[PDB]
Design a protein around this ligand. Structure first.
Ligand code: 0LR
Ligand code: NAG
Length: 332
């Protein structure tokens, strides 16, 4: 007998405002993994004991220590703008919070040092739709919905500033982590956590996305990202400069930087300089990083902006599967 009355919370660790990860258990007895809960991907994967560079520094799933394991073996490749992993399919029981689900997942045998050496987590729990799942593997949240345990077919994200690192709620939202009410925006289409964006303002003027654009709400992305063209105009308006990997401003100029507003649904979602500048110094002789970068996301998802951790820290986000919508409320 299953009742639709469960809301399960998962505590997240915040690593340097760029990586938010929690724990999942795989197998019998459970093998624990640190995972990023990512709305921009639809597959579950962890490094495998069968792995070979980055595998030496992470926890590895050993199917031979699990009584609940079911062999599959189908080859799996997950390719993204952030990185590419490869491996094979396996089935086992996955526990997330208090929910236990039989899940088809990827045992990763190919983990490149770039960017996986920089990862403090072991794997990724894809929070996206089946439409974007590689190998048409049923995503974890669809398997949780099938169970009929959830109070609501929603999941929410709280990302704290770098003390609770963050929290994911399965089956609802935590009113202790937001203020006021949620404002909802319907998805353009089911299959992707993406909504229409009406404009991007720098200061009081609509400088970008003037004829509208797309916004992927991506929990696994560290930063806000835009296309090369959009980011070039944004960075020139901020007076930011491209160093080796990131855009920087002179630390003394950081607090004076203009507000950046994203016009979504019938509301402006504003990030002040404090929300997007890693203000590690106030010195005129030091360089301060911006939590914004360019990413040319390929079709079908892109060209699109991606609202990552930079955005989520400011706005508590609810991903609603029953109504195909995303809700935002000011985080606390
Ligand atoms: C495998 C690779 C990349 C991703 C993307 C898919 C779109 N959303 C962002 C995710 O990146 C998560 C991620 C992956 C590697 C990382 C390595 C270092 C730091 C952060 C990292 C974050 C999912 C699975
Ligand atoms: C692996 O699982 C998929 C279901 O997602 C199935 O279609 C496929 O035939 C399985 N392969 C093996 C070898 O069991």
């Amino acid at each position: 007998l299953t009742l639709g009355n469960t809301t399960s919370s998962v505590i997240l660790t915040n690593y340097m405002d760029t990586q938010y990860y929690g724990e999942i258990g795989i197998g019998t007895p459970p093998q624990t993994f640190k995972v990023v809960f990512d709305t921009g991907s639809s597959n579950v994967w962890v490094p495998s004991s069968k792995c070979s560079t980055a595998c030496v520094y992470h926890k590895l799933f050993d199917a031979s220590d699990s009584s609940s394991y079911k062999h599959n073996g189908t080859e799996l490749t997950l390719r993204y703008s952030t990185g590419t992993v490869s491996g094979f399919l396996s089935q086992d029981i996955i526990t997330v919070g208090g929910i236990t689900v039989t899940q088809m997942f990827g045992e990763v045998t190919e983990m490149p040092a770039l960017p996986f050496m920089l990862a403090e987590f072991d794997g990724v729990v894809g929070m996206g739709f089946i439409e974007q799942a590689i190998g048409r593997v049923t995503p974890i949240f669809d398997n949780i919905i099938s169970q009929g345990v959830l109070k609501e077919d929603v999941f929410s994200f709280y990302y704290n500033r770098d003390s609770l690192g963050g929290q994911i709620v399965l089956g609802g939202s935590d009113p202790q982590h937001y203020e006021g009410n949620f404002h909802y925006i319907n998805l353009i289409k089911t299959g992707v956590w993406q909504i229409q964006m009406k404009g991007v303002s720098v200061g009081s003027s609509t400088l970008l996305c003037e004829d509208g654009c797309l916004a992927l709400v991506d929990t696994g992305a560290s930063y806000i990202s835009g296309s090369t063209s959009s980011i070039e105009k944004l960075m020139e308006a901020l007076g930011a400069k491209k160093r080796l990997f990131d855009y920087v401003v002179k630390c003394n100029e950081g607090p004076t930087l203009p507000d950046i507003s994203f016009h979504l649904g019938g509301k402006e979602y504003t990030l002040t300089s404090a929300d997007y500048v890693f203000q590690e110094s106030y010195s005129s002789k030091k360089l301060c990083t911006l939590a914004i970068h360019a990413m040319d996301i390929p079709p079908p998802t892109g060209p699109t902006w991606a609202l990552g951790a930079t955005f989520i820290r400011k706005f508590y986000t609810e991903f609603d599967r029953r109504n195909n919508r995303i809700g935002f409320a000011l985080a606390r």
